[PDB]
Curated annotation (Swiss-Prot):
This is Bromodomain adjacent to zinc finger domain protein 2B. Residues 9-113 form the Bromo domain. It comes from the Eukaryota. The gene is BAZ2B. It is found in: Nucleus. It comes from Homo sapiens (Human). The lineage of its organism: Eukaryota, Metazoa, Chordata, Craniata, Vertebrata. Belongs to the WAL family. Expressed at varying levels in several tissues, whereas a smaller transcript was expressed specifically in testis. Component of the BRF-1 ISWI chromatin remodeling complex, at least composed of SMARCA1 and BAZ2B, which regulates the spacing of histone octamers on the DNA template to facilitate access to DNA. Within the BRF-1 ISWI chromatin remodeling complex interacts with SMARCA1; the interaction is direct. Component of the BRF-5 ISWI chromatin remodeling complex, at least composed of SMARCA5/SNF2H and BAZ2B, which regulates the spacing of histone octamers on the DNA template to facilitate access to DNA. Disulfide bonds: none annotated. Regulatory subunit of the ATP-dependent BRF-1 and BRF-5 ISWI chromatin remodeling complexes, which form ordered nucleosome arrays on chromatin and facilitate access to DNA during DNA-templated processes such as DNA replication, transcription, and repair. Both complexes regulate the spacing of nucleosomes along the chromatin and have the ability to slide mononucleosomes to the center of a DNA template. The BRF-1 ISWI chromatin remodeling complex has a lower ATP hydrolysis rate than the BRF-5 ISWI chromatin remodeling complex.
Amino acid sequence: SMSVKKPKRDDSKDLALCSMILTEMETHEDAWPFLLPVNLKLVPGYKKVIKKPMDFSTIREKLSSGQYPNLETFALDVRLVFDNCETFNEDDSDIGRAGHNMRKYFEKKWTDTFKV
Ligand SMILES: CNC(=O)c1cc(Cl)ccn1
């Protein structure tokens, strides 16, 4: 509270670390459904069903232009990508399984990087 400071982590490497993690996502072989925005004019139903589209290149642009206040908002966008994927794609589809794979890959990188 006011004048009662909570010890907080050193965040100075966060930006660099998130860029690193995002580069690893982008270079993963199953990243292909997520590299670019879904083409809302070629994909039937997506615009109406998915209220907040997100993709890696958009995350990269936001990361590169100071649009993430902190680690957590970055992680929210990454998770949104896989959340949208699950919403729209069958689990037993190539894109659906890509999503589950990429999510798992992210969470491991995330844990390995930031959680002790
Ligand atoms: C993340 N990409 C998708 O969810 C998607 C799904 C379909 Cl069917 C076509 C293009 N993109």
